[PDB]
Design a protein around this nucleic acid. Structure first.
Ligand SMILES: N[C@@H](CC(=O)O)C(=O)O
Ligand SMILES: N[C@@H](CC(=O)O)C(=O)O
Lengths: 585, 585
RNA sequence: UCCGCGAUAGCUCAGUCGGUAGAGCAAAUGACUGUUAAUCAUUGGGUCCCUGGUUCGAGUCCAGGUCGCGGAGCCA
RNA sequence: UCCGCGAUAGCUCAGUCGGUAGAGCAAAUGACUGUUAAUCAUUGGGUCCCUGGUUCGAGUCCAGGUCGCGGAGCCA
């Protein structure tokens, strides 16, 4: 039916006649000559109409925006003073022999025009015309191209595209599970998976050497800019491989992927320990595009008159880190206050600062209310260590380790972006050597990866001082965002029971919830380790998108609702009763 | 860590030493020589041990079934009288230099041996060792290879791998939807999709010319041998194409797929109308491997003494079809009774028959209680038309059209398999020219495809006598099973509202449930049509599997439960209350 | 919801007439240099799906219930 | 659950001091042979998120509620 795509009309097609189908982007009427910009998946082309055939002209005057039309005409090499740079087929035209309106179109709620600041609620309510926009279309086509490349790579390296079930068993240890009432088992529920974890491990026990799957995952947690309740994840699991082999394969994949699509190269991936990343960046996912760095300085603030410093400086559970931000002594007190509230949202009691103006003048030349409570010597070697000179300002996080790490960690990236201090485009890295556990506002512990992660120690050295236990885990970080990660799994069962005990799971749940896991571990489980990628975030980075919603066909709002389909919706009492449940108002 | 896979040890590797990791399939102990059959993803190999290195021997005597071991040895060209035909590396051996037990294994509940009639409940409860069996593994690897080929094809033809959301809006027209309580919208529910239908259509409106997706689909309906509650489906949708183009592309895909994997060719796909398929096979999915055929014969039974024949023979709403099954006059009355009950389960009041023994002897020579109520002439031309001779038997379905179609339709395939009358291996075909609607035990109508299917007539000729309306639908059938199908969609909105009205959906639901559809249709929807494949059934056919559960990693039971993970399970009252619901006992 | 079949050792299953528990395989131990579904011997192993009822007595009979398989309904 | 920002024509938004509704764009109509974000003119277009309360009077003020965005909690 169609001869060629509009956005694929080259100069070589001159003289030839073409039949193209598509939408009417915009129409320009001069009376004696009518212009149409016809759009399809490949781009836009221009069709011109003269009244020598007044019927086609009549079918050109009635045509409005976003009409679905089929045009047959001749490819005319357009004049030199009429060539369009933006249009890929802008050095060419089509004289319209015959036009047909395949379908009419009502006026599009928002324009598909250059720089129209719609308007995300409206773009989501009419997502089916929002994706008409070449930008969105390019993003989605890019996502498809990406998954194409990844699938190709993983297939070429002996991985098996295996599907794992969505309807699974509900357990109360991981993230909040979406529940599905069972019609056949009243009082029981299915649960949507956060990850095909247990299943992929079983597939390793099953003898499949290498498994991969681009799988749907579901978390009933609240949303954020890079977090959706329903997210697609690139699952990978292998047998008889250590962490070096795994990070090797996955890194190789990411490199090949970035070279196939964006055609970029990454030099090398720095392996950074968790401790270091927390020490000098205050984040488990450092943004290495920002040269700003946290520097410990509490060693010089032990016997100082200022008490909010010497407090945690002598407290082993906390620290006092400094943060030099350059040329910013000229900061208005307004901005300082904004930053103090900002570090406030992460738990910081306040935000001490030192404005450096003249270091040659000693204590004076250092504008700050704090400069009085700190001796000149300590002060000077602090400014020396932090690398500050005239014009800079040094912020201070002095509190519990977690608090200063989080507050200065976030302040770092914030003032990093606010001053545009990004030093490179792509900053890939590996965060390695994690702790095995962490405590959550309470004596309760939780694995910072997942309870199936292999510890470095033995099952005896684990239930004794679990805090000194390291995990065989590893995360991949790109431009401050977590591309993904994984770990080497437990296969000793005894060990698995050890970490299950230390996490508060007694043998009741061990048998009832994770019984099949222990079983599979006892019936000959091989050394296996894996990794997962957040496909959504990956595409968000590769496109350069602001939000995850920009790289998802039909995303959801912060309340996990879809404005286009009005989901979630109401269900009649019949189907509700059939699932053996009642509501409550 | 591993040098080579066990099942990839060729003769060329002779002399070379290899390190292979895997499971211990079975062990044979002769005392002075120990034999191990080591298995991995590629197959089995044999490792031999002599006591000249008694430590490795000690690590060979302790080893039992399904132990996870790593063996380093030398590839020895085994003697001629010891070569194994079944084993791919059976003309070779490995003398074990050093062995290491990577992990021990408890005795496998069922054996992984040749012809052990386990035992599907046990195979499902321990699915992680069931998939160790080379057969299951081969099935899954085949499935992966299939999806690989399909993805490759569709990608090569300008289709876009786009993901559609799982959490959608609940509607009460299609199949029973699985519901998901909303934590943020109390009293409202999400619903798992039966198909990405509306979404794929929106993606057609969105300007993406060609879309495909291997998507998860969910139906809360009871199960069968080829029906699961959670099934994977190959979704396809295109714009600006008619049914001929679509059936062309999809058929081309299936051909290429069958040639890439099984390396078979299909001659041509016969296009059979719905009416014909129902007339001479009594099924919308004919098994063309069975030469047995239904033949209308009611025209000869108008004024006959037998009343169960002449009843429906004069009734326009019903018919009298005959079914000749050859050489089966020798059938025991037991088998006849079994068949009568069998056609009984499909609504047939009974099952009249004629045993043909001697046609030269006239009415006698025809053993039957019915032969008395039917004149000799009519009888004889019936036997002539049905093609019966001495030794054959002719069954009769005389009832309402639906009843005889279903009962004889099923009897046909049953006696087709029971007598092994399969004439070819692959019988591909297209069933085309469906009716638009059908009534369900009630004045209520339902589209036999789906309410978005394009009718052949106009929106006026549709609300008037809807029974004379044909759909632009098409199904692909292989060996009697439905591989899939699709149709050309509605884009007139007026038409969509017409079929929505005739299906009992008032403008209330039209606005509330399918509002976004009508909207998208009004804002410039192109002529689009699509198709979907049941990937599960496809793999079931290509493998030659008995059940769908054989080609699914972790399938479910007839009550939609998983015996391995004990799903569905119970959830604590906290998470239950958080989703704003209560149970009832 | 309906029809039909089924549940006994780790696995496949027999178990009569209602009379108080068996085989093969597997496992553990033993012997053996060439088997490849190794052979051979010794030994261990029971919530007869659950719950009740009739019996002096229940794997066996009755009733209800649970689970697994095929089908009908259902599967736009 | 908490912090912050936000809702006015189809779209982007102004709306003062509480005084009874506006712009640009879009649409419909008109003119024009060369524009490419065409130009120009005429005309149409309001559930000021919802619900109440104070006022002679509410887009404006108060209270509760709904929705959308960023973040905290949360996200094994
Ligand atoms: N599924 C894990 C990663 C893995 O175990 O591979 C996660 O999402 O953190
Ligand atoms: N999704 C439809 C087929 C299609 O519309 O393509 C079905 O399952 O019957």
């Amino acid at each position: 039916m169609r001869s060629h795509y509009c956005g694929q009309l080259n100069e070589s097609l001159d003289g030839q006649e073409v039949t193209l189908c598509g939408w009417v982007h915009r129409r320009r009427d001069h009376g004696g000559v009518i212009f149409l910009d016809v759009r399809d998946r490949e781009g836009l082309a221009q069709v011109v109409f003269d009244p020598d055939r007044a019927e086609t002209f009549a079918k050109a005057d009635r045509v409005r925006s976003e009409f679905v039309v089929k045009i047959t005409g001749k490819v005319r090499l357009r004049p030199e003073g009429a060539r369009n740079p933006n249009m890929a087929s802008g050095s060419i035209e089509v004289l319209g022999y015959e036009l047909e309106v395949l379908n009419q179109a009502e006026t599009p709620p928002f324009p598909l025009d250059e720089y129209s600041d719609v308007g995300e609620e409206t773009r989501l309510r009419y997502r089916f015309i929002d994706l008409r926009r070449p930008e969105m279309a390019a993003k989605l086509k890019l996502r498809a191209r990406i998954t194409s490349s990844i699938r190709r790579y993983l297939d070429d390296n002996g991985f098996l595209d295996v599907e794992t079930p969505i309807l699974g068993r509900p357990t109360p240890e991981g993230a909040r599970d979406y529940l599905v009432p069972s019609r056949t088992y009243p009082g029981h529920f299915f649960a949507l998976p956060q990850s095909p974890q247990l299943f992929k491990q079983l597939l390793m026990v099953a003898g499949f050497d290498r498994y991969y799957q681009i799988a749907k995952c579901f978390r009933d947690e609240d949303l954020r800019a890079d977090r959706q309740p329903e997210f697609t994840q690139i699952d990978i699991e292998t047998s008889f491989l250590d962490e070096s082999d795994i990070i090797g394969i996955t890194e190789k994949m990411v490199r090949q992927l970035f070279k196939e699509v964006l055609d970029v190269e990454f030099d090398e991936f720095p392996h950074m320990p968790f401790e270091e990343a927390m020490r000098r960046y205050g984040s488990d996912k450092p943004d290495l595009r920002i040269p700003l760095e946290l520097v410990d300085v509490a060693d010089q603030l032990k016997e100082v008159e200022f008490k909010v410093f010497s407090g945690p400086a002598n407290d082993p559970k906390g620290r006092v880190a400094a943060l030099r931000v350059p040329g910013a002594a000229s900061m208005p007190r307004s901005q300082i206050d904004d930053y103090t509230k900002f570090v406030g949202i992460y738990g910081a009691k306040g935000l001490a600062y030192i404005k450096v103006n003249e270091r040659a003048k000693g204590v004076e030349g250092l504008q700050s209310p704090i400069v009085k409570f700190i001796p000149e010597a300590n002060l000077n070697v602090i400014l020396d260590r932090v690398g500050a000179v005239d014009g800079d300002i040094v912020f201070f996080g002095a509190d519990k380790a977690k608090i200063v790490c989080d507050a200065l960690g976030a302040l770092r990236i914030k003032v990093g972006h606010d001053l545009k201090l990004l030093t490179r485009e792509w900053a890939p890295m590996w965060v390695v050597d994690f702790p095995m556990f962490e405590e959550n506002d309470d004596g309760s512990l939780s694995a910072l990866h997942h309870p199936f992660t292999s510890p470095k120690c033995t099952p005896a050295e684990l239930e004794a001082n679990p805090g000194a236990a390291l995990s065989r885990a590893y995360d991949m970080v790109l431009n401050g965002t977590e591309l993904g990660g994984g770990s080497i799994r437990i296969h000793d069962k005894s060990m698995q029971q050890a970490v299950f005990r230390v996490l508060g799971i007694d043998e009741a749940e061990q048998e009832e919830k994770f019984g099949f896991l222990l079983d599979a571990l006892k019936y000959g489980a091989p050394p296996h380790g894996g990794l997962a990628f957040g496909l959504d975030r990956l595409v968000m980075l590769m496109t350069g998108a602001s939000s995850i919603r920009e790289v998802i066909a039909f995303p959801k709002t912060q309340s996990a609702g879809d404005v286009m389909t009005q989901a979630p919706g109401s269900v009649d009492g019949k189907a509700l009763r059939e699932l053996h449940i009642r509501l409550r108002e």
